[PDB]
Design a protein around this ligand. Structure first.
Ligand code: CA
Length: 315
């Protein structure tokens, strides 16, 4: 009398592809530009059949949905940005879960909007072989809408929306120390940014702009003591070196640098650490401040969560 069923355990997901090196998690798939979407089997205890769950891409699942974070709409990921390994998920006899592989193409990573919440892979299960049913939900109204929880007494679990975004290898949270040779409104001075313990150094975020570029927001004082913000753009080459450029309309910038894996020995927490070293010049033309800076940036953590649930709103 048993009634086997298949479903997607989560309806809204956020996958951040973590390129490069991660300490706390295995990102082999990420470095191959891949992700896996998983389905589950239930309503029984032993799966006696080879189960095949057919699904299709259904772009209308995105209708009327917006990211809670940004208030922008969920956008169906363009077909050329990703390749599904199959049109079905197979859960073999004796197994209770399985997944389908997604290969993200170079097209995905070239899109400037792929560094943030924008594109979504939307899937609907169609039929199932080897189990009685797909968990389609129990509607409390006619014309029910899958993505509107209020339309159901038992929620539908036959679809999933995966928002996808990426970070490049240099993306991370870093501790920064260095020396600025400054000229502030004609007055020259050295600014030493150094705390006795690497642990207490200034915390800064290097975010992703593209496959090669990153952004780093900093501040420096004007002649009045007020803090002036500005953004530098780092652009990385195959060999690990970078050039330094402006990322803010208020600053002209030039320089060079490098990422060195394990460049800092017996650094933060006694472990050897990944670091970025910069030698650069900044002209804050509107504020009359010029800085010749040498910086050391120690990696504290990549600060990425590969998989989270996604908060969406239905305006
Ligand atoms: Ca049965």
């Amino acid at each position: 009398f048993d009634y086997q069923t298949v479903y997607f355990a989560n309806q809204y997901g956020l996958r951040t592809i973590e390129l490069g090196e991660s300490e706390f998690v295995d990102n082999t798939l990420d470095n191959q530009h891949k992700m896996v979407i998983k389905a589950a089997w239930g309503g029984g205890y032993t799966n006696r059949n080879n189960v095949v769950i057919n699904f299709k891409v259904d772009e209308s699942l995105c209708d009327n949905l917006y990211f809670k974070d940004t208030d922008q709409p969920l956008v169906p990921m363009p077909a050329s940005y990703y390749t599904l390994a199959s049109d079905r998920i197979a859960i073999p006899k004796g197994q209770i879960m399985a997944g389908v592989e997604v290969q993200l193409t170079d097209d995905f990573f070239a899109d400037e909007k792929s560094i943030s919440e924008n594109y979504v892979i939307p899937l609907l299960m169609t039929n199932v072989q080897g189990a009685d049913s797909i968990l389609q939900g129990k509607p409390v109204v006619e014309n029910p809408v899958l993505t509107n929880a209020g339309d159901w007494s038992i929620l539908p679990q036959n679809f999933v929306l995966y928002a996808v975004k990426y970070v490049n290898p240099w993306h991370g949270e870093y501790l920064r120390r260095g020396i600025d040779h400054a000229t502030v409104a004609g007055t020259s001075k050295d600014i030493i940014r150094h705390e006795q313990f690497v642990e207490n150094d200034e915390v800064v975020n290097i975010s992703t702009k593209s496959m090669k570029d990153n952004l780093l927001t900093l501040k420096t004082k004007d002649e009045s003591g007020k803090d002036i913000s500005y953004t530098v753009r780092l652009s990385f080459a195959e060999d690990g070196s970078c050039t330094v450029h402006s990322g803010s309309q208020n600053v002209v910038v030039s320089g060079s640098g490098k990422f060195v894996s394990k460049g800092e020995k017996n650094s933060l927490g006694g472990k050897d650490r990944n670091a970025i070293y910069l030698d650069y010049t900044v002209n804050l033309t509107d504020n009359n401040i010029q800085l010749a800076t040498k910086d050391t940036l120690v990696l504290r953590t990549r600060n990425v969560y590969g998989g989270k649930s996604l908060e969406v709103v239905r305006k």
